[PDB]
Amino acid sequence: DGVGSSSGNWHCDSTWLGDRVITTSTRTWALPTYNNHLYKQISNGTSGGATNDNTYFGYSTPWGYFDFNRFHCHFSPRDWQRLINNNWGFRPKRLSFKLFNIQVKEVTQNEGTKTIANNLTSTIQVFTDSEYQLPYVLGSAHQGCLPPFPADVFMIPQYGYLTLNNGSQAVGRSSFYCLEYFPSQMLRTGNNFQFTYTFEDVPFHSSYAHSQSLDRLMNPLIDQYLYYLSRTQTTSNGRGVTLGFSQGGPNTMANQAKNWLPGPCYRQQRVSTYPLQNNNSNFAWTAGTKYHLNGRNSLANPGIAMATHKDDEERFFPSNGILIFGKQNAARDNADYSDVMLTSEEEIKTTNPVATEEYGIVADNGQTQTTAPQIGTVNSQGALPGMVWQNRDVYLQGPIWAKIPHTDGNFHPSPLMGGFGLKHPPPQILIKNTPVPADPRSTFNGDKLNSFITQYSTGQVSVEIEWELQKENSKRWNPEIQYTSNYYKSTSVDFAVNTEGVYSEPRPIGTRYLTRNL
Amino acid sequence: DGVGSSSGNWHCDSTWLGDRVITTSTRTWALPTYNNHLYKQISNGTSGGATNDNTYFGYSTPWGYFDFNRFHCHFSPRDWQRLINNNWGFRPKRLSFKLFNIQVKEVTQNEGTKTIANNLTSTIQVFTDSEYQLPYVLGSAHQGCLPPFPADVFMIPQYGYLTLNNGSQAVGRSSFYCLEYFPSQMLRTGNNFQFTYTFEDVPFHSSYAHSQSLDRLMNPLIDQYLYYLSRTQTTSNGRGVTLGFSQGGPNTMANQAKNWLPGPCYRQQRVSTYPLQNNNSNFAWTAGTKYHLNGRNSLANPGIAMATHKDDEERFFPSNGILIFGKQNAARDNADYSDVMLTSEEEIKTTNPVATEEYGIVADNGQTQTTAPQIGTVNSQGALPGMVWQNRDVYLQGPIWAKIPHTDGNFHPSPLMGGFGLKHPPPQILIKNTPVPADPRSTFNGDKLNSFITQYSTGQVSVEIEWELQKENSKRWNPEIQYTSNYYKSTSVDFAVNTEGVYSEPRPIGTRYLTRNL
Amino acid sequence: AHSQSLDRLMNPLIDQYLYYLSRTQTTSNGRGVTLGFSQGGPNTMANQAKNWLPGPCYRQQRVSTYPLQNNNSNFAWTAGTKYHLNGRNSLANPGIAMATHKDDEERFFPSNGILIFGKQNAARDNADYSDVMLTSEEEIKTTNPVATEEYGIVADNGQTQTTAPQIGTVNSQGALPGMVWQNRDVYLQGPIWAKIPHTDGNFHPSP
């Protein structure tokens, strides 16, 4: 394997075998030099216009990293359709990673002309953090993924991390990390890199909706043998005290005894899609739903999984309580409503409470002959025995996994942006250009060398994931709901390039179409 | 195999062994970057000056493809002569393909000076579509073949395809294809590519003419024992009704009973080579012979195989009903009659009807004593039991095969431009330069990379086809007609270069010289 | 369904090496006779040479779903598309497989040329249009001709200097070499099999 032989081939394919499917993707990347080969302290503090909520302390490194953690990395729109229409669930099993056909290039400036040449003896260096010894920066939903469309070339993002801070300052427990203090592999243009990984057992993502609601599980034809208190007061003659009792039945179903409870609630503020129906004020931050950690307020975004709206409320959404994707060429700041794509969790109404409404009612007081009953409203409810709930849905544009924090305890460790929680997630992959010094002085100086040759590198990357499928077995007589493409004529095809060669994704696509009994 | 060793050799040869011949060709190619590495939506619609007949919707890719589908790719004029003079038929058997001695080159502009350098670490990528999963664009008689003359260097054509349209717009069933979504092989300058293919059983092309005509198959010396109706009216005395009957014989041969029928007819409009004999008007489109598909009119070019003209009519040809080749350096649009070469199907008069004339006559009405017989003219005739016909001839400049459309049914699936119809034709071969990014910015941006280094590639291509021959076995006493070269002196040699180094082909050469009994 | 149409199989980016007759008459100066020739290309695609032909045609009469657009008369039987067997006329129902309508014609259907299912509790005789369910074969436009339109145009005569060209319209077309076609679709309410008649010969024995 010299300079004249390729170290790998292009693999983009999908294979559907029985109970599993295997996806494989190849992309072309470009890796710049970051920071001028330097580590740098970064911070932000309230001395400037920053509020206390936004302060941080950390470091930016001279390293890049690979991110394949979105679904459109591994699935074409047609492959995603086969998955969601035919299956009740899926989970990842194992992956392979390859890095090959590396070429390092040097650029030099003379006056205004720029030239690029090959540097055949330069290296890049790569390693995986397989012992989870670095701050794990995947799972924060950052940009810099492998592109959804296989013909696009992408830039590799810069690695950095945060530590503890007090304001803009570091405390005694703050940690610093040098990535050169890790063994890594060095590659010239004829070398290549690969590794394999196995996922730990994780539950299947549930791709389906319930065809029953938690409060409707009864037989509509039969009475219950249990009684409830239907009457505290005599109707006949005057008004007087009595105890009446009735059995629950077809017309009283709201009164019947039940075995189960809806899932937990943390209430969100309601926002209409028609702006004229909203109050006139800027309440996005002040009315936002937050948590409070070490004197510092953080918006709970999206939060726990709750139904977006109830029946015929579709114009409302929770303020910070949903995932929002941008359309192609949308602005970074202050984008309009026509520029973004709002997801809906509406399928989970059958089980989870609605995000913008109360959980229920409890008794505020005890009552007497002289004191009337008082009722409270429950806007926040933690886990109660007998609750059942659904997780948030996953999307073709959305994240796949997250790393579960290493802690004494946790409760239902499913990521709140949606995905698979993992104690040992796929390891993060660090990549860097090796610095090449410019000619030094001819007399010894002990200071470090600050003058380098300008370089960048390009190459190929492949990733292959095996997925396990859960087949749908159902006696439903009538046809299902399916994801489909519009039949009518159009100026362009959805999920294709336009006249200018730009690939766009028209809408977000969820996973829940087939149904199952509750 | 490094940068200093060649990955293949030059093979151009022909070998005649018994019942088979093997041809092999080598050419030099050049592959540009197309579209700036982009896929692009293309369309045409009636909003502009385009009529509804010419509308389309589709995509152009950044890929090239190889086309060897003309006969002059595989045969020298002398080899074609050996074939057509000595054999009654031939068909293809198997082929081999090689791609070797690849070299990638980078071109950079500084002011007005241009320089070209080798880029030793760059790749090209190649694949064959062997599962027939792409729109099959061969068999449309496009330019971009391997040149007929082995010393010429050719440019590789750009790949593209069409989908369904309504006007300039796409409908719901329109498909988009990314060719990067196919596994492909990547080659640096020291690598090479090859594959083999086997043709499915196909009938021999018939290279011969019939020495008998379908209506002359009788013994000229003997009467038939069958009778026909020769007389409806009394000749003697006055005019009166009678039924006369006669046996068919040597002088009545037009009246004899026969077992067979001429092939099908779709009539063409007649055009004289002497312009003064044609009507004065532009009737090429308005008088053209067409079919009508989804509200959109398409000229039937050339159409079903019919004889070009009858005896002593040689000055006439069917309007859109023949193949027309251009001479060397002929114009693209509005070329003169001396610039083009008209083929003639005249050999099939013995069987197929003439293209510009009616099929026959049928009865229009039933007759009575008061009603005289009425006759209709048959200008279009589909398949009747007892028909026999010949296919259109093949030429040294013409196509070899076509892909048979995948459909519920078809009738006599022989391509109408002439050739071998194939359910699984030789697979199409896609080739592309791998994009090499220019130096990116030193701070991360998430947009795709639009800036590249300009490159192109060159190399060698070999193709080898084995052909099976059908030997001629004949008791004819007198000598045959043969294809020959003119004996008389000339300014240049036919099928050679001129003073300027330009190779030309003087005339089209068909396959049908030897004869056979009908 | 096919995602391509039989007349669009070409590469949109490239010219053909074959020529066609584009010009019978001189544009410049006066009107005079000449022979012009052009190569087929991206903008001329209707003129290009092709290898294949659409399937066979037996034309049907056209009926609009909006009754106000139909002629005023009872033409169902008299304008019906028939065959004639032993002196006895039989409506050809549904007939050979043809596309129900072309683009943006969806309001039209062939008279006896489609399958029609009734809704629940529909009348036996003289049911209304809201009582029945019309199928559509529209998916086969890419290959088969439309049921209510002509197959194509052929030459009626030979031409001379004194005689102008005449064109005929082809309303019925049998099998030609190079045709391809699709069968009629099957439905959840429809039949599964049929018995092929026992005969000396048949052509494409699909029910």
TrEMBL record, chains A, B:
Residues 1-490 form the Coat protein VP1/VP2 Parvovirus domain. Signal peptide: none annotated. Keywords: Capsid protein, Nucleotide-binding, T=1 icosahedral capsid protein, Virion. Belongs to the parvoviridae capsid protein family. This is Capsid protein. Its main location: virion. One of its GO terms (cellular component) is T=1 icosahedral viral capsid. The chain holds residues 220 to 738 of 738 of the full protein. AMP binds at residues 414, 421. GO terms for molecular function: nucleotide binding; structural molecule activity. It is found in: Virion. It comes from the Viruses.
